[PDB]
Amino acid sequence: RLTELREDIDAILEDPALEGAVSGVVVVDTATGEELYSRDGGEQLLPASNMKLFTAAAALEVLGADHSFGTEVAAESAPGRRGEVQDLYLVGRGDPTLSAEDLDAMAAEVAASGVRTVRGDLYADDTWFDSERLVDDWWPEDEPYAYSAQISALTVAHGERFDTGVTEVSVTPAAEGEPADVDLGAAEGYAELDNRAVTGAAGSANTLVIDRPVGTNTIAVTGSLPADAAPVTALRTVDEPAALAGHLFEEALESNGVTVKGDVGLGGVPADWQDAEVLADHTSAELSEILVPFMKFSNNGHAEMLVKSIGQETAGAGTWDAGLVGVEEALSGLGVDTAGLVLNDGSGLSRGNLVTADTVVDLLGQAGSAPWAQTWSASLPVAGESDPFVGGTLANRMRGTAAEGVVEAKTGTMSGVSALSGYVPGPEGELAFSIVNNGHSGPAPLAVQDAIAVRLAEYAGHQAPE
Ligand SMILES: [Co+2]
Ligand SMILES: [Co+2]
Numbered sequence: 001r002l003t004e005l006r007e008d009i010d011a012i013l014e015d016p017a018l019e020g021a022v023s024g025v026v027v028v029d030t031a032t033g034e035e036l037y038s039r040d041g042g043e044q045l046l047p048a049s050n051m052k053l054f055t056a057a058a059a060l061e062v063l064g065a066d067h068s069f070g071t072e073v074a075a076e077s078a079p080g081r082r083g084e085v086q087d088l089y090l091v092g093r094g095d096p097t098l099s100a101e102d103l104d105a106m107a108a109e110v111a112a113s114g115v116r117t118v119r120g121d122l123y124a125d126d127t128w129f130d131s132e133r134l135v136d137d138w139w140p141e142d143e144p145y146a147y148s149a150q151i152s153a154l155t156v157a158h159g160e161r162f163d164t165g166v167t168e169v170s171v172t173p174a175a176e177g178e179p180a181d182v183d184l185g186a187a188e189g190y191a192e193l194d195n196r197a198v199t200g201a202a203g204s205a206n207t208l209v210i211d212r213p214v215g216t217n218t219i220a221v222t223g224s225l226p227a228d229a230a231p232v233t234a235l236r237t238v239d240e241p242a243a244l245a246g247h248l249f250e251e252a253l254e255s256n257g258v259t260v261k262g263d264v265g266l267g268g269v270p271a272d273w274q275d276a277e278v279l280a281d282h283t284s285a286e287l288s289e290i291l292v293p294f295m296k297f298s299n300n301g302h303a304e305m306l307v308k309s310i311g312q313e314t315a316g317a318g319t320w321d322a323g324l325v326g327v328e329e330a331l332s333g334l335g336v337d338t339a340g341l342v343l344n345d346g347s348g349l350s351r352g353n354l355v356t357a358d359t360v361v362d363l364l365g366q367a368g369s370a371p372w373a374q375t376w377s378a379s380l381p382v383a384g385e386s387d388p389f390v391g392g393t394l395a396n397r398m399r400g401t402a403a404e405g406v407v408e409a410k411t412g413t414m415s416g417v418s419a420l421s422g423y424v425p426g427p428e429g430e431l432a433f434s435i436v437n438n439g440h441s442g443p444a445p446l447a448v449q450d451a452i453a454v455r456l457a458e459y460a461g462h463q464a465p466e
Contacts, residue, residue, distance in 0.1 A: 001459070002036060005036065005037065005455065005456075005459050006036075006037060008455050009025065009027075009037050009452055009455065012448060012451045012452055012455070013025065013039070013448065013452075015445065015447075015448050017440060017442065017443065017445045017447070017448060018437065018440055018445055018448060019440065019441060020439055020440065020441055021437055021438060021439045021440035021441075021445070022040060022043060022045060022437075022438050022439050023039065023040060023435070023436065023437050023438075023445075024039070024040045024041060024043050024045050024356060024357030024358075024434065024435070024436040025037060025038070025039045025040070025041075025357060025433075025434070025435050025436075025452070026038050026039075026041045026357040026358055026360070026361045026433065026434050027361075027431060027432075027433045027456065028361050028365065028431065028432050028433075029429045029430075029431060030364075030365055030368060030423075030429070030430045030431060030432050031429050031430060032429070033365075036431070038358075040357070041356065041357050041358040042340060042356050042358050043356055043357070044340055044342070044354040044355070044356055045354065045355060045356065045357070045417075045436045045437075045438040046351055046353060046354065046355075046414070046416075046417045046438055047348055047353055047354075047355040047360070047412060047417075047419055047436060048348045048412030048413055048414045048417045048418065048419055049298045049300075049347065049348040049410065049411060049412030049413070049419070050348060050355065050360060050410055050411075050412040050419040050421050050434075050436065051303075051345070051346070051347060051348030051353050051355070051412070052294075052295060052298060052303050052346070052347060052348055052410060052412075053360065053363060053364075053410050053421060054327060054331060054341070054343070054355075054363060055303050055306055055307065055327060055346040055347075056291060056294070056295060056306075056376065056379065057330070057331065057334065057363060057366075057367050057370070057376065058310060058326065058327040058330035058331055058334075059287060059291075059306040059309070059310060060287065060288075060291075060370070060372040060375065060376060061330040061331075061333065061334060061370075061372075062310045062313050062314060062326055062330050063287055063306075063309060063310065063313055064287065064372075065286065065287055065288040065372045065375045066286055066287070066288075067286060067287040068283050068284045068285060068286045068287070069093055069094050069095035069096070069097075069283070069284040069309070070093045070095065070281060070282065070283055070284070071090070071091065071092045071093065071095050071098055071102070071106070071154070071281065071282045072091050072093075072106075072278050072280065072281040072282070073088060073089065073090055073091070073106055073109070073110055073249075073278065073279045073280040073281070074088070074089040074091055074125075074269055074273075074276040074277065074278055074279065075087070075088055075089070075115075075276070075277050075279055076270075076273050076276060076277065077277050078113070078114070078277045078279070079113065079114040079115040079116075079279075080114075082116075082117075083114050083115055083116035083117060084115070084116070084117045084119055085115055085117075085118055085119070085120075085279075086118075086119050086120035087118075087120040087121050087122070087123060087262075088110075088115075088118045088120070088121075088122050088123070088260075088279075089122075089123045089124075089125050089267070089268075089269050089276075090103075090106075090122070090123070090124050090125060090154065090245060090246055090249045091125040091128075091154070091269060092124075092125065092126055092128065092152070092153045092154025092155070092242065092245065093128045093153060094128060094129060094153050094305055094308065094309045094312070094318070095155075095157075095282075095284045096155075096157060096162060096164060096284075096290060096294070096299070096301065096302040096305045096306070097157050097162040097284050097285065097290055097293070098154075098155065098156060098157050098245075098282070098284070099156070099157055099162075100156060100186060100248055100252075102282050103156070103245070103248055103249050103252045104252045104255065104256070105282065106249070106252070106280035106281070106282055107249065107252035107253045107255065107256040107258065107280070108256050109279065109280035109281075110253060110256070110258055110279050110280050111253075111256045111257055111258050113279045113280070115258055115279065116257070116258060116259065117258070117259045117261065118253070118258065118259065118260040118261060118262070119261050119262070120261070120262045121262035121263045121264070121265065121267075122246055122249065122250055122253075122260050122262070122263070122264045122265075123246065123264075123265060123266065123267030123268075124154050124242040124243055124245050124246030124249070124264070124265070124266055124267070125153075125154065125242075125266075125267060125268045125269055126152045126153040126154035126155075126241075126242035126245075126266070127153065127268035127269075128153035128154075128312065128318050129151070129152065129153040129305075129308040129309075129311075129312070129318030129319070130308070130317075130318055130319050130320075131152075132151070132319070132320065133150035133151055133152070133240075134148070134150060134151065135304075135320065135344065135345045135349065135350050135352075136344075136350075136352070137344065137350055137351060137352045138349055138350060140214045141214075142349075143212065143214060143237065144210075144211055144212035144236050144237055145235075145236075145237065146163050146166045146235040146236075146237060146301075147300045147301075147347075147349065148237065148300070148349065149163070149164050149165035149166055149237045149241065149300070149301045150165050150237060150238075150239065150240070150241055151165075151301065151304045151305060151308065152165065152240075152241040152242045153242070153308070153318060154241065154242040154245045154246075155241035155242065155245060155301070155305075156186065156241065156244060156245045156248055158186070158235065160293070161293050161297050161299070162290075162293050162294075162299065162302070163235055163299070163301070164241065164299075164301035164302070164305070165237055165238060165241035165244075165301060166235045166236060166237050166238065167184060167185040167186045167187035167190075167191065167219075167235070167236060167237075167238055167244070168185035168186070168233055168234070168235055169182065169183065169184060169185060169210050169219055169221075169233065169234045169235075169236050170182070170183040170185065170231055170232070170233045171183075171197065171208060171210065171221060171225055171231060171232040171233075171234075172225075172231045173199045173200075173225045173226060173227050173228070173229050173231075174199045174227075175199060175227065176199055176200065176201050176202065176227045177198070177199065178198075178199050179195055179197060179198060179199070180195070180197040180198065180199050180208070180221070180225045182195045182197065182219070182221050184219060186244065186248055187219070187238050187244060189247070190217075190238065190243070190244050190247040191212075191217050191218065191219050191238050191239075191244075192216075192217060192218040192219070193218070193219055193221075194218050194219065194220040194221065195221050196220070196221065196222045197221040197222060197223055197224070197225060198223075198224050198225075199224070199225055199226075199227050200224035200225060200226045200227065201226065201227060202226060202227045202228040203226060203228060204224060204226045204227075205224070205226070206223075206224065206225060206226055206229055207223035207224045208221070208222075208223040208224065208225045208232055209221070209222045209223045210232070210234045210236055212236055212237060212238075212239075216239070217238060217239035217240070219236060240266065242266055243264070243265065243266060246264045246265065246266070247264055250264050287375075288372075288375035288378075290302070291375060291376070291378075291379035292378065292379050292389060293389075294306075294379065295379035295380055295381070295392070295410065296379065296380075296381055296388070296389060296390075296391075296392030296393070297388075297392055297393065298392075298393055298410075298411065298412070300347035300348075300349055301347075303345070303346035303347035303348075304320075304345060304346045304347055306323075306346055307320060307323035307324060307326075307327065307345070307346035308320065308322075308323050309323070310322075310323040310326040310327060310330070311323030311324075311325075311326055313326070314326040314329070320345065323346070324343045324344070324345075324346075327343055327346070328341070328343055331363065334363075334366050334367075334370065335366045336359070336362050336363050336366050337359065337362055338359070339359075340354070340355065340356035340358065340359045341354065341355060341356075341359055342354035348412055349414075351414075355436065356436075357421075357434040357435070357436045358434075360421045360434035360436070361421075361432045361433065361434045364421065364422065364423065364432035364433075364434070365432055368423075368430075368432070377408060377423070380392075380408040380409060380410055380422055380423075381393050381394035381395070381408070381409060381410065381411060382394065382405065382406075382407070382408055383397060383398040383399075383401075383403040383404055383405065383406065383407040383408075383409065383453065384396075384397065384398045384399035384400070384401070384403065384404030384405065385404075385405065393411040394407075394409060394411065397446065397450055398450050398453060398454060400464050400465065400466070401450070401454045401457070401464050402454055402457035402458045402462035402463050402464050403424075403450070403453050403454045403456075403457040403462070404464065404465050405465065406424065406425060406426065406457050406460070406462050407422060407423070407424055407453050407456075407457055408422045408423045409421060409422030409423070409433075409453065410422055413444045413446075416438060416439055416440065416441075417437065417438055418437040418440070418444035418445055418446065418449065419434070419435060419436045419437065419449075420433075420435045420446075420449040420450075420452075420453060421433060421434040421435065421436075424453070424456045424457055424459075424460045425460065426457065426459075426460025426461040426462050427460070427461035427462075428459065428460050428461040429460065430460075431456055431459075431460055433452070433453070433456060435448075435449050435452055435453075437449075
């Protein structure tokens, strides 16, 4: 059976879509340790979001599956009989899932604790991590997009996917000839609007563009939206996620009948403060639960927040330098051979990252007998599953194949880089595989990857659901 599986993967990898590409492909029976297939297994390749595999494992080792994150509100002393504080501080400690509703509930606590007036200023404190918002070699042109959100200790997560540091922009058509209506979402009165967008004739071509030009906090909307068109909604990032958090907290406070009389900006708790009075707090869910939106949808911001959180835990330093070493050391402590690894970030956005397919599989084996193996496993996309929180980035891949419902695997695509790595359980042993593609010249070789995963599922003794 093994001899023929090698022939089959050989033929699959002979696909025209892999022209000029290097492909690291490694397959291991995780019970025996038997290497079933290996090709360029020790070759160093960009992993794209397969890099999140290393990050997730290290966060579970360093922080633990029980770990949660806090946000709190702090005045120098409690409110008076008059119900007055001076300056107020919103303080974030790396919560990657902090919502607008979470800010409202803390605003309700500030009120219920007897504040009616903030006489001084409101500060957003994100000093728990450094203020290095983006990695060195990330591309400025990617910066308006949610996957390239700025990294902060204090960031507002949008929606049930928990997309951090962004706002939802909605563009609605009006009468033909009238400007389109732009709704900045949460960033209303925070980000600036530059609306050059017109409403086009009914049935005209849609040419609408929503940008944030580099080094500005301005949403620039150009082009035409047809009068008959459906509204356009787009997640766009903001400059200084903490400042937007501070902004939304200001409104949250005011909405809960707390008057803020001064300004909103960045600032850390003075330390001059003998014993700061905590007027509100919030605790995230635990890391094991947070791992699901993180890994299923491949959240870049979560990953980089987890790295800085690892840096804080191992070193007291919310820093890429500190957190990345912490990743490496945790993986080493896990029994992983990190020789072939180059860690430049936690998400895999960086083109400075290198893995090898042998390293990936090594980790997949080591993660399988870790105490946290089940929380880790549950976080991965499941091939062909309809439910977005189950199937994730694999929800519309491998449906009606032997892989559907069985293959748990992490994805990762950029220009010239694609990857699929994970597990294949079955009647004939549980397998770990890594498929890493670099240097191909068109569309990501996703069908080739599906083909391999599918064959392995068949080999593991599975059949397509009908
Ligand atoms: Co506003
Ligand atoms: Co099956």
